[model samples]
Target: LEDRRIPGTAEENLQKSSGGVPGQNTGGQEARPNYHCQLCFLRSLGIDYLDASLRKKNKQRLKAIQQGRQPQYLL
Candidate 1:
């Protein structure tokens, strides 16, 4: 009887080149600032109309409160 053995179907493993230095490749990406607010979240969730109105009103309210003026309906 003839000897039967499994045949190799692939090439041997090769060593990879390891002579290049690691470098940052950001590809001109911009870094977003850490700016979070109620209106910002609302806008991200597709609430543009309410977000715009509330942002304006909220800014006015905050400015009025800072200037010692109380809100009309702050019960």
Candidate 2:
């Protein structure tokens, strides 16, 4: 059973390294800012999640919005 444990996962490592989420962190331990809001639920706890494809899509969406046009990225 000991071998069954695959050790700490990526999220666990990120949490540890990020010092937990906001309003739920220890003293002097700052939380890592999540920079992947357009990807997934990274901001649920301020986890810095990133995705290139999603970022590109988000950029297009922003451009559309700035151009006073409807969101037509999918179109």
Candidate 3:
């Protein structure tokens, strides 16, 4: 439930990488906050997140997700 501060430990950072769980929670079940995802966190480290824009594109992306299609932005 926080921003892009690197994870507590090396293992934690590795486990929270984009390839791993995005915005992973610390303990057991809890609300996964939207403040940041793994890719976005990379931005603070000077690495870029390769996803596309959201603003008005979310509608299309949302529909694609519901229809079982990978969003173009993710492609």
Candidate 4:
């Protein structure tokens, strides 16, 4: 629901690092807010959130999400 920022700020680039698998969010099944996935949040800030752009290209899908459809692409 918000942007996560951090890049050159750290000596190690998160792009090259690995992440832990996420736990399921079963917080009582409230209606989830319209939201961009976490990585999209990072791209909004133009930070490299992953090791490669191949994944970044899929980011275009976020736009559809904002339009109340599914994301087709991101700006």
Considering only N, C-alpha and C atoms within 3 Å, which residue pairs clash in candidate 3? none
Winner by TM-score between candidate 3 and candidate 1: 3
lDDT, each prediction? 0.40, 0.41, 0.41, 0.42
Off by over 4 Å in 4: 1-17, 31-75
Find the number of clashing residue pairs for candidate 2.
Answer: 1
RMSD of model 4, in Å?
15.7
Residues 1-75 of candidate 4: C-alpha lDDT, one tens digit per residue: 755556554535554432333333344355333355764564354644432333444345355345554233222
Best-matching candidate per lDDT: 4
Once fitted onto the true fold, the runs of candidate 2 whose alpha carbons sit more than 4 angstroms away are: 1-53, 60-62, 71-75
lDDT of 4 at 34: 35
- Over the stretch 1-75, how does candidate 2's per-residue lDDT look in tens digits? 444434666446544432312243343337444455632365342542333323444445445446644344231
Which candidate has the highest TM-score of all?
Answer: 2
The number of clashing residue pairs in model 1 is: 0
| Higher-ranked by lDDT: 1 or 2 | 2
**Worst window of 10 by summed lDDT in candidate 2:** 17-26
For model 1, residues 1-75, the per-residue Cα lDDT tens digits are 864443442222222321232232333345222356753564355765543534444444455456544344320
Model 1 scores worst on lDDT over the 10 consecutive residues at 10-19
Query: Could you report the Cα RMSD, in angstroms, for every candidate shown?
Result: 24.3, 15.1, 16.0, 15.7
Between prediction 1 and prediction 3, the one with superior lDDT is: 3
